[PDB]
Ligand binder design. Structure first.
Ligand SMILES: O=C(O)C1=C[C@H](O)[C@@H](OS(=O)(=O)O)[C@H](O[C@H]2[C@H](O)[C@@H](NS(=O)(=O)O)[C@@H](O[C@H]3[C@H](O)[C@@H](OS(=O)(=O)O)[C@H](O[C@H]4[C@H](O)[C@@H](NS(=O)(=O)O)[C@@H](O)O[C@@H]4COS(=O)(=O)O)O[C@H]3C(=O)O)O[C@@H]2COS(=O)(=O)O)O1
Ligand SMILES: O=C(O)C1=C[C@H](O)[C@@H](OS(=O)(=O)O)[C@H](O[C@H]2[C@H](O)[C@@H](NS(=O)(=O)O)[C@@H](O[C@H]3[C@H](O)[C@@H](OS(=O)(=O)O)[C@H](O[C@H]4[C@H](O)[C@@H](NS(=O)(=O)O)[C@@H](O)O[C@@H]4COS(=O)(=O)O)O[C@H]3C(=O)O)O[C@@H]2COS(=O)(=O)O)O1
Ligand SMILES: [Ca+2]
Ligand SMILES: [Ca+2]
Ligand SMILES: [Ca+2]
Ligand SMILES: [Ca+2]
Ligand SMILES: [Ca+2]
Ligand SMILES: [Ca+2]
Ligand SMILES: [Ca+2]
Ligand SMILES: [Ca+2]
Ligand SMILES: [Ca+2]
Length: 318
């Protein structure tokens, strides 16, 4: 079953919480410990409630006050923690599309790992919040098959899980084989239709059969046949089909990979999944990397930032 690491706090008193926060910031300096200890122990819904209580009591904006009092990565984490759950993905996508450049990894990460219901919710929130259509903006900042696959995924029309059809599994596996390894070049359109619209249960069967037929895992063929953002997107899609938790766990691993850390990604994953499947992510993480996610973060981060991340993540055993 899917499980997160953050849940509603029992005996929740938003008014009292707003007072704690006001006390942590009022006056010289800031009580960062008090702030993180509280917010990481409250669900996203409760945080929004605290924000309204804070404003009702003081006429001050909670998030604006924390941005004034805080700084660095700790601030970025607190700000993300404050973003309403329903708007967070839309927010990160908007951030990925701002300016002339484009943050492809974010578009790929979110669009490949969100369910059709989540994408429908995101598309709506995005347009309501920014006054523009998500698909349109994505199309505007992307090109080629990478763009097309993203558009297919944005339609949020992946087939639901229905009775498994053996002939169909064989048919699709063989089709991918002819579209890639057996073709001079690649029939990208076939990979996009099959990997982007077929059901999760169907594709899991297809991946197994594909290996049996070709001798290659679908991930290997993808690397052999494609490159650029298309390659990254197809891998993310395949990995999410196998296991969203596993994909995100791997996403975290390569974010604390080597000199320095990809904090933007580290924060987004921890925050976005904290109330969905961060627990599952932890398990898949421990199994695949022989170390708990906790240890990874602990040795890659520091300060209040580190403290907050560790409280949200949890599972120091694992
Ligand atoms: O009790 C739980 O453990 C549990 C309960 C919750 O409902 C759910 O958590 S939730 O937070 O999402 O609410 C979660 O459900 C598990 C489920 O218990 C697992 N069952 S087990 O594998 O037998 O142990 C499992 O179930 C899914 C299977 O993985 C999936 O197989 S495959 O796609 O990987 O090949 C299988 O899919 C069926 C599908 O349901 C059928 N639909 S139909 O309406 O009958 O047509 C149809 O499409 O066939 C496929 C394949 O059938 S076959 O496997 O018999 O050959 O069944 C799925 C399912 O029943 O949900 O995983 C879920 C989710 O796991 S997770 O931990 O939340 O990630 O845990
Ligand atoms: O004399 C005091 O009463 C007083 C002095 C000290 O500076 C400080 O006490 S201390 O013990 O902490 O050292 C405390 O500062 C008050 C400040 O006087 C208040 N100003 S008031 O609204 O006019 O009463 C208020 O300040 C906040 C206001 O939004 C604004 O202040 S002001 O210039 O209008 O007077 C200012 O807003 C900044 C914002 O903080 C910035 N944030 S960011 O980090 O850069 O992202 C940014 O958004 O710019 C705006 C606007 O700047 S502009 O004015 O130059 O255009 O600062 C706000 C703030 O400091 O939070 O509250 C503080 C703190 O009050 S508390 O009761 O201790 O919590 O009191
Ligand atoms: Ca202060
Ligand atoms: Ca301090
Ligand atoms: Ca700041
Ligand atoms: Ca852009
Ligand atoms: Ca780029
Ligand atoms: Ca080929
Ligand atoms: Ca081609
Ligand atoms: Ca390649
Ligand atoms: Ca590192």
């Amino acid at each position: 079953a899917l499980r997160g690491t953050v849940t509603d706090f029992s005996g929740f008193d938003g008014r009292a919480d707003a007072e704690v926060l006001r006390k942590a910031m009022k006056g010289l300096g800031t009580d960062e410990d008090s702030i993180l200890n509280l917010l990481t122990a409250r669900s996203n819904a409760q945080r929004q409630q605290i924000a309204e209580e804070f404003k009702t009591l003081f006429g001050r904006d909670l998030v604006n006050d924390m941005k004034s009092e805080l700084t660095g990565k700790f601030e970025k984490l607190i700000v993300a923690l404050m973003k309403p759950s329903r708007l967070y993905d839309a927010y990160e996508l908007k951030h990925a599309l701002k300016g002339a450049g484009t943050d492809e990894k974010v578009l790929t990460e979110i669009i490949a790992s969100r369910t059709p219901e989540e994408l429908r919710a995101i598309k709506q929130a995005y347009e309501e919040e920014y006054g523009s259509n998500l698909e349109d903006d994505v199309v505007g900042d992307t090109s080629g098959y990478y763009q097309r696959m993203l558009v297919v995924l944005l339609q949020a029309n992946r087939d639901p899980d229905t009775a498994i059809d053996d002939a169909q599994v064989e048919l699709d596996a063989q089709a991918l084989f002819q579209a890639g390894e057996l073709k001079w070049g690649t029939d990208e359109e076939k990979f996009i239709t099959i990997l982007g619209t077929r059901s999760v249960s169907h594709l899991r069967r297809v991946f197994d059969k594909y290996m049996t037929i070709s001798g290659f895992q679908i991930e290997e063929t993808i690397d052999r046949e494609t490159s650029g953002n298309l390659e990254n997107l197809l891998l993310a899609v395949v990995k999410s089909i196998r296991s969203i938790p596993a994909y995100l766990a791997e996403t975290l691993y390569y974010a604390m990979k080597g000199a320095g850390t990809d904090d933007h990604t580290l924060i987004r994953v921890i925050v976005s999944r904290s109330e969905i499947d961060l627990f599952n992510i932890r398990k898949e993480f421990r199994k695949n990397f022989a170390t708990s996610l906790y240890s990874m973060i602990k040795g890659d981060t520091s300060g209040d930032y580190k403290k907050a991340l560790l409280l949200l993540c949890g599972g120091e055993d694992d």
